[PDB]
Design a protein. Structure first.
Lengths: 227, 227
């Protein structure tokens, strides 16, 4: 049975040092790249560092380069991560994992807390490209990193070679000249622009925008292109 | 008829200065906040600066604060943007727009080019939260900022209070013990994780990951929660 067990986590001051260890068993340790992947509290996953089976190659994420050093002892089937110049940003549960760049096996993780003793809303849109035929239904998504009422989520269109134009101020309230086949829905974090039946002119790029706080940020855009 | 016409764009060296102008007509200029919004070549939209009808308030994006100064001449119905310490990052088509924080009317824009004479893949997932009942079909999306073959897009699951576990190495090739109701599709920029019929244990957070280049980045996660 494959087992990865982490050790050495705990509380450390900013600028301090900490060395993590991972004991591997149940497989030929030297035949696998080994990795460290971390998860900040309430956040997602970030690969940290990897090392090939023979230590011939090491890889690091840019944010830890020059401060972290990965190593392994094949005679004792143990993986190490020496962490120096620790910053509050490094606070996370650190998982030992196998192999690289995907991760087939995960340990349970060890918590590293770098302690002494808001923000702007990001909009992301999906999909990047919608490939549809005229007359088909188009469903475009917009995601807000923080809660936004439907009263503060707008939609824009930009035809190729033209300027952006407003489609929807908020909710499904359309600007002048915008036909009713465009409707907006959603409130909170996830929003939808529906084009019930695509017309030739509807093949364009679409942007969502939150207008509840300054700066009023735009999503990165969804291109609706003809099949 | 509302008209907004920009002027003053052109080529300028890094560190140089440029003043844009916008002539407004067809409406009572002094009754509207006026705005500048820019679009870098091949990029999305970024609000730059706004000014209330009486110039009592001005707003700026963090990236231009201290370098740009917005102003208006209500007697001549003209909006201005003085741009100092110009950086290559400021290269964009600059649009005059009305009002704030949404934009009802747009000019055609003027091009500002700050010239002397790659990158990491970002994954974004949608929606943020999927609220479904057991037995229903779940469709999760993942978007890559650059092209990725299906052979290098993996999917992970993280149940609450547990470590992440791999679901799919690439395409729809599942890890050991992962049932066939999880399938992966897509190749290029837009990917899908389908859970054909939700089981109670499937209510969790799901992450996509691209494994084609270093760093192997993760999406920000999609939470599938019970209705």
């Amino acid at each position: 049975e494959v087992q990865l067990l982490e050790s050495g986590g705990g509380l450390v001051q900013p600028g301090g040092s900490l060395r993590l260890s991972c004991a591997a068993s149940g497989f030929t340790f030297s035949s696998f790249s080994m990795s460290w992947v971390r998860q900040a509290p309430g956040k997602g996953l970030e690969w940290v560092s990897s090392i090939s089976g023979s230590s011939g190659t090491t890889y690091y994420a840019d944010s830890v380069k020059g401060r972290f050093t990965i190593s392994r002892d094949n005679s004792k089937n143990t993986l190490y991560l020496q962490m120096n110049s620790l910053r509050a940003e490094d606070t996370a549960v650190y998982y030992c994992a196998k192999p690289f760049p995907y991760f087939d096996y995960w340990g349970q993780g060890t918590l590293v807390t770098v302690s002494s003793g808001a923000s702007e809303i990001v909009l992301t849109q999906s999909p990047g490209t919608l490939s549809l035929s005229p007359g088909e239904r188009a469903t475009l998504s917009c995601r807000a990193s923080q809660s936004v009422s439907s009263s503060f989520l707008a939609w824009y269109q930009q035809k190729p070679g033209q300027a952006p134009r407003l489609l929807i101020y908020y909710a499904s309230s359309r600007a002048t000249g915008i036909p009713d086949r465009f409707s907006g829905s959603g409130s909170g974090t996830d929003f939808t622009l529906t084009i019930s039946r695509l017309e030739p002119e509807d093949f364009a790029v679409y942007y969502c925008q939150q207008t509840g706080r300054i700066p009023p940020t735009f999503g990165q855009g969804t291109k609706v292109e003809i099949k």
